[PDB]
Amino acid sequence: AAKIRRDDEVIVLTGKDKGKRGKVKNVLSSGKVIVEGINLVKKHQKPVPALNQPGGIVEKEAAIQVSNVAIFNAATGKADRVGFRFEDGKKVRFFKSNSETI
Amino acid sequence: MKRTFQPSVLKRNRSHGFRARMATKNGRQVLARRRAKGRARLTVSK
Amino acid sequence: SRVCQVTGKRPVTGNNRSHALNATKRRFLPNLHSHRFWVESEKRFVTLRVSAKGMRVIDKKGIDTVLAELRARGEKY
Amino acid sequence: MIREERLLKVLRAPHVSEKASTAMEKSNTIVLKVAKDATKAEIKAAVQKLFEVEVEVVNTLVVKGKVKRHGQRIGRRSDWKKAYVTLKEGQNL
Amino acid sequence: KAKELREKSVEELNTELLNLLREQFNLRMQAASGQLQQSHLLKQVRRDVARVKTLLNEKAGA
Amino acid sequence: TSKWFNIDNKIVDHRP
RNA sequence: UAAGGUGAUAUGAACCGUUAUAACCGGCGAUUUCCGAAUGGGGAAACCCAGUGUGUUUCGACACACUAUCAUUAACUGAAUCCAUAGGUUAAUGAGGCGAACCGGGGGAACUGAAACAUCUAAGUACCCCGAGGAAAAGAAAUCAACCGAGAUUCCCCCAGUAGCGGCGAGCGAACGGGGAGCAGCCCAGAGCCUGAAUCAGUGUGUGUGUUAGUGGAAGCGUCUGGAAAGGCGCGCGAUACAGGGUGACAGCCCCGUACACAAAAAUGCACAUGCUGUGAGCUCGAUGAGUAGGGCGGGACACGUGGUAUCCUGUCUGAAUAUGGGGGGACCAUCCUCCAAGGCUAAAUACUCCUGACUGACCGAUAGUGAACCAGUACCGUGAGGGAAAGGCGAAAAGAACCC
RNA sequence: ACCGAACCGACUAAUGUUGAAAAAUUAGCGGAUGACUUGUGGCUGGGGGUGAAAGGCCAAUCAAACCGGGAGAUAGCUGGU
RNA sequence: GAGCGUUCUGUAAGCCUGCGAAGGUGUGCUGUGAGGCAUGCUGGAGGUAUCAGAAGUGCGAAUGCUGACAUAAGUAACGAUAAAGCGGGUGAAAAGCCCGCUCGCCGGAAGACCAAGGGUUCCUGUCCAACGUUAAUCGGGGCAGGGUGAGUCGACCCCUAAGGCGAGGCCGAAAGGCGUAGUCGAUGGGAAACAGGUUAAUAUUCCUGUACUUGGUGUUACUGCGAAGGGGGGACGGAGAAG
RNA sequence: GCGUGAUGACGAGGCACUACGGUGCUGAAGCAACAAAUGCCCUGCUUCCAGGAAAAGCCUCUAAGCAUCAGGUAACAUCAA
Ligand SMILES: N[C@@H](Cc1c[nH]c2ccccc12)C(=O)O
Ligand SMILES: [Mg+2]
Ligand SMILES: [Mg+2]
Ligand SMILES: [Mg+2]
Ligand SMILES: [Mg+2]
Ligand SMILES: [Mg+2]
Ligand SMILES: [Mg+2]
Ligand SMILES: [Mg+2]
Ligand SMILES: [Mg+2]
Ligand SMILES: [Mg+2]
Ligand SMILES: [Mg+2]
Ligand SMILES: [Mg+2]
Ligand SMILES: [Mg+2]
Ligand SMILES: [Mg+2]
Ligand SMILES: [Mg+2]
Ligand SMILES: [Mg+2]
Ligand SMILES: [Mg+2]
Ligand SMILES: [Mg+2]
Ligand SMILES: [Mg+2]
Ligand SMILES: [Mg+2]
Ligand SMILES: [Mg+2]
Ligand SMILES: [Mg+2]
Ligand SMILES: [Mg+2]
Ligand SMILES: [Mg+2]
Ligand SMILES: [Mg+2]
Ligand SMILES: [Mg+2]
Ligand SMILES: [Mg+2]
Ligand SMILES: [Mg+2]
Ligand SMILES: [Mg+2]
Ligand SMILES: [Mg+2]
Ligand SMILES: [Mg+2]
Ligand SMILES: [Mg+2]
Ligand SMILES: [Mg+2]
Ligand SMILES: [Mg+2]
Ligand SMILES: [Mg+2]
Ligand SMILES: [Mg+2]
Ligand SMILES: [Mg+2]
Ligand SMILES: [Mg+2]
Ligand SMILES: [Mg+2]
Ligand SMILES: [Mg+2]
Ligand SMILES: [Mg+2]
Ligand SMILES: [Mg+2]
Ligand SMILES: [Mg+2]
Ligand SMILES: [Mg+2]
Ligand SMILES: [Mg+2]
Ligand SMILES: [Mg+2]
Ligand SMILES: [Mg+2]
Ligand SMILES: [Mg+2]
Ligand SMILES: [Mg+2]
Ligand SMILES: [Mg+2]
Ligand SMILES: [Mg+2]
Ligand SMILES: [Mg+2]
Ligand SMILES: [Mg+2]
Ligand SMILES: [Mg+2]
Ligand SMILES: [Mg+2]
Ligand SMILES: [Mg+2]
Ligand SMILES: [Mg+2]
Ligand SMILES: [Mg+2]
Ligand SMILES: [Mg+2]
Ligand SMILES: [Mg+2]
């Protein structure tokens, strides 16, 4: 199973923006996630009269590695690691380091 | 000047076609060699 | 083919060796002849391509025995 | 008898062009792109029973593929059959 | 769709197949004429025709 | 291939 | 098994799915156009044309199935010819074609070496053809040995580059015996007591071990340089896990993993145990493979080139003894020794890799390594067999340059 | 049979000879109802075919085609090291 | 006889290195030489001491192999000695494109239709990078869209020639050679459509008008029908002459 | 050749627009003589020697067989190509 999933609260371990927190918007197949408000890039959008005729420079979010983002504990207030357990037949995910089920 | 290739599809197919290759025993060997090489086109038909 | 129906003799290869020992390939052919044998069990004449050694085998063993052997080996006659 | 399975499979598409529009407005003819293994009787039965019109005759022709180039990689657009179906003066699809 | 298609008899399956084929023809003509923004209907009808054929073959027992 | 004045015989065999 | 997904260049549109019919992976099934052994006839492969039998029609027609040849067996029918045979028709069973190499067999070169060349070598090699298998072949002494003995076949190391063969040149080159790998013996040629008993094949049924999907899998922070820390410095923790890969620079502790412990509804391999079918063991008496062994002529195989040449095979011509007999012991004779041809079956050790998985490398790194790291047997060339390339790298992430001249 | 276009051929001269062309152009030249010429198709295969015979022709190749193989033949010879 | 260097293995989970590695390009020092050392600039992530070990270990020559780039040189040439001139249009630009008026060339062809062969080159819109021996607004170039309509034309189909294959068969070490019954094989024999009109692009195919052929079914009338067999026909040369 | 097909079609031009490329409407005479093919009668006729495909379609006769049935001929209708 995947340790970091959609709509989690994550904290960036390494990169331009180490320490910033964010919420995962969607997870790509290539092991990359898009976290809202984290990895901002300045796209120069080309205006097209058929569709989206405004131009301008647009600041959007780019993909960051699932290895680079780590789950946020929110109890100890810092990053944590996720294991897997069986509770009542369901494979559930839990923070290590005080062993609390997510 | 009259050159050596005066083309004709009928003579081409009766000479080098797939059914002539299967008709002679060594033509089947030719097809075996070409399949073992991996040709896109075995005979002159396509 | 030049194959005896009874004894199975077929051509074999050898050499011509001359006085200077020059070796060139050659074939030994069996002494094949097409002979009509009178079979009494069927009141019939059966034609066989048989060598003279095969004819001697016929005369020793009996035509019925070798016809049974030929039928066992499966070849027609 | 030609089965409804066969009819619903053989009629593929309408055809739009200047010549098809002229044929419609002049000779009461519709132009249909048709699957290749369909015959004249099959096209006539399919049109007559699915469009609820009546057919005088049908004319078929096979449209050949086109050799195209996509980034210096040669390809071959495929064949299809085209059918000119003539109607009996009072149908007007 | 599979179980409720399986809980039908052969005549119901054949007329379901004919209805699905009629819908397939209508969708194909609309998409060729320049309508039918919804192509998932084309895919769904094709796969459902395949399902109906599968159940017909199983009910015939081959 | 080859030049015609090299294939020729009257000029190639010039000094026999 | 899952919170994501609708294969790639390749975005986009329309959507499906989020606790279980999304998607993905595995077992079993279903569909599987046309050509191709192609198999209903034909054919310029992917096309043309049918015959027959069922069933349906809106009376226009439509759907499905079968129809090749050869071999064996059986039925029916049946000539010259009176029975019979030859033949014909049908039914059932089997075969055909493809595949890298290894294996058995039928044919079989030459360049070359001899410092020329012819016997000889190259060489029973290359190549052609036939057939079979997971291996094949060979195999249970008419074998060797030496007066002592061994005990089927196969493969490796010695014997030994020895004895021998040899225009006694070039070259070819054993065996006896010894050390190992592996071990296994039986049946018909025929009658009787006896019960179907040992041993093998198919078909089921149980137990293990797998194979085809998978699950869990430990332990890190602060600070400085820096675009970015995995790097420097300080201080901790795991280790049956420091194999390997990725992550914005070099990570045991960020991710995938690894050691380890588990997992199978369904199909299948193997080793057991157990039913049915087919098969027969044990004991007594008897029998002991004939155009054969051998011989004359011509060849071939044995390291052995006809030589003093044993032995094996046979194209031609002959031709015994047959257990009170016969073969071999390197011309041949006598004595002695040892074995029993003219019927057959048999595992292992051994040979190879088109293909599958894992791991390795004092192997290569884009003129190298496959011809081919890239849509390569492609483009192109030739009527055809056939020949046959070039061409890898932005960046960490497209943030791939809005807008103005 | 004769003269002469189509058609078949190729006697002479010049041009061209890295050409417009791996055999032609231009101006003249020979046959032109015959042993003629031509279209489509078939057959003959490499020590072989075919040859009104030149060792001519057999796919721009012929005192023995082309393709793959024995093959890395051999080279007391030349070049390079 | 003694050595330098290069690639790779061990020493090496060591040492140097984002405070800048290899590589590239200069400078300075140094050894008898092959060479070494230090550093500036580009580079942007690897390199390797020391002592041993293994070699795809060192290139200027082979009419050497592969790529790149010079030279002759802005030289020869620009492909029939049938021939061009002007006005207007479009365009950034016109000797070449479009339209017009002249001029010239072919006219048993340099005109029109096919078979063979090719495959979208046909027509329309747009573009001028590359192709076109110059330019290009043009093209048989790029891109996109359209276009080929059959009972009568041709194939398919019936029938055979040369010849091919060939159940059985005869023959041959094997493969295979020939060949009967058959079955293929046109370049030949076999039924039937003409005139006018239309599209930017098809027409004996579409439309208008007027026809023709073969076969199946069903009524009517008369009636001996039937082949794989017999006969006729199909069915055939060269030249010439005239109506 | 003639009649019919054809009181039809086509027709020089004239009239009107034009996106000046071409469209829409109407339309008189529409005969005779002569010359004449290498084309047709002619797969003919005359002549010559070198003596000039095959099979099916087509017409016709019967065998086995069917025998007031099938089947055949002639007309009409419809369908199909
Ligand atoms: N020189 C002349 C003739 C020619 C052609 N090939 C030849 C070969 C050898 C001698 C002369 C020639 C030419 O070019 O046409
Ligand atoms: Mg019509
Ligand atoms: Mg058509
Ligand atoms: Mg066939
Ligand atoms: Mg068939
Ligand atoms: Mg046929
Ligand atoms: Mg087989
Ligand atoms: Mg020699
Ligand atoms: Mg020699
Ligand atoms: Mg020599
Ligand atoms: Mg065996
Ligand atoms: Mg003893
Ligand atoms: Mg896991
Ligand atoms: Mg883990
Ligand atoms: Mg750190
Ligand atoms: Mg870096
Ligand atoms: Mg014995
Ligand atoms: Mg003997
Ligand atoms: Mg002897
Ligand atoms: Mg003996
Ligand atoms: Mg002896
Ligand atoms: Mg390469
Ligand atoms: Mg490189
Ligand atoms: Mg080609
Ligand atoms: Mg004359
Ligand atoms: Mg000549
Ligand atoms: Mg001459
Ligand atoms: Mg001339
Ligand atoms: Mg003369
Ligand atoms: Mg003359
Ligand atoms: Mg001579
Ligand atoms: Mg030639
Ligand atoms: Mg020779
Ligand atoms: Mg050799
Ligand atoms: Mg050599
Ligand atoms: Mg290096
Ligand atoms: Mg090292
Ligand atoms: Mg070297
Ligand atoms: Mg160099
Ligand atoms: Mg030198
Ligand atoms: Mg000069
Ligand atoms: Mg000059
Ligand atoms: Mg000049
Ligand atoms: Mg010019
Ligand atoms: Mg001008
Ligand atoms: Mg000009
Ligand atoms: Mg002009
Ligand atoms: Mg003139
Ligand atoms: Mg094109
Ligand atoms: Mg054009
Ligand atoms: Mg320009
Ligand atoms: Mg240009
Ligand atoms: Mg074009
Ligand atoms: Mg014939
Ligand atoms: Mg045969
Ligand atoms: Mg034959
Ligand atoms: Mg025929
Ligand atoms: Mg013809
Ligand atoms: Mg045209
Ligand atoms: Mg004439």
The domains of chain D, with CATH numbers, are 2-93 (3.30.70.330)
CB atoms within 10 A of CB E3: 6
Say what angle helices E40-60 and E10-33 make with each other, to 10 degrees: 160
F16 to each of E37, F4, F10, how far by Cα in Å?
Answer: 91, 20, 11
Cβ of D28 < 7 Å from strand I? Answer: no
Q: In whole angstroms, what is the distance from residue C26 CA to residue A31 CA?
A: 78
* Cβ(C76)–Cβ(C27) below 8 Å: no
B30 to each of A35, B19, B27, B34, B37, how far by Cα in Å?
Answer: 62, 12, 5, 6, 11
**């075996």: which residue's tokens?**
B32
Q: Which domain holds residue A50?
A: 1-102
One-letter-per-residue 3-state SS of A23-78: EEEEECCCCEEEECCCCEEEEECCCCCCCCCCCCEEEEECCEECCCEEEECCCCCC
The resolution of the experimental structure, rounded to one decimal in Å, is: 2.9
Domain edges within chain E: 1-60
Identify all chain D residues contacting E24, using CB atoms and an 8 Å cutoff.
8
E18 to each of D44, D63, E30, E49, how far by Cα in Å?
Answer: 20, 30, 18, 9
Q: Which domain holds residue C9?
A: 1-77
**Phi and psi at residue D43, in whole multiples of 5°?**
-65, -40
Answer whether D12 sits within 8 Å of E32, measured CB to CB.
Answer: yes
Give A43: exposed, middle or buried? Use CB within 10 Å, 0-12, 13-18, 19+.
exposed
The set of long-range contacts for D69-76, using a CB threshold of 8 Å and a minimum separation of 24, is none
Count of domains forming chain C: 1
Experimentally, how was this structure solved? cryo-EM
Hey, what amino acid is at D51?
F
How far does the CA of residue E23 sit from the closest CA of chain D (Å)? 10
Map residue B25 onto helix, strand or coil: helix
Q: What is the CATH number of the domain that holds B32?
A: 1.10.287.3980
**Phi and psi at residue B8, in whole multiples of 5°?**
-155, 125
Helix (H) / strand (E) containing A84: strand A82-87
**């052969």: which residue's tokens?**
E10
Q: Residues by CB within 7 Å of nucleic chain J, which ones? A: D 40-41
CB-based contacts of D23: which residues, under 8 Å, 6+ apart? D29, D30, D31, D84
Give D67: exposed, middle or buried? Use CB within 10 Å, 0-12, 13-18, 19+.
exposed
Give the max Cα distance, chain D: 51
Count of domains forming chain A: 1
Q: Which domain holds residue B2?
A: 1-46
Q: In whole angstroms, what is the distance from residue E11 CA to residue D85 CA?
A: 35
For the beta sheet containing D11-14, the strands, ordered from the edge strand earlier in sequence to the opposite edge, are D11-14, D29-34, D80-87, D55-63
Q: Which nucleotides of I are covered by protein (CB under 7 A)?
A: 116-120, 142-144, 146-151, 165, 169, 171-176, 186, 199-201, 205-207
Q: In whole angstroms, what is the distance from residue E6 CA to residue E52 CA?
A: 9
Answer whether E32 sits within 8 Å of D5, measured CB to CB.
Answer: no
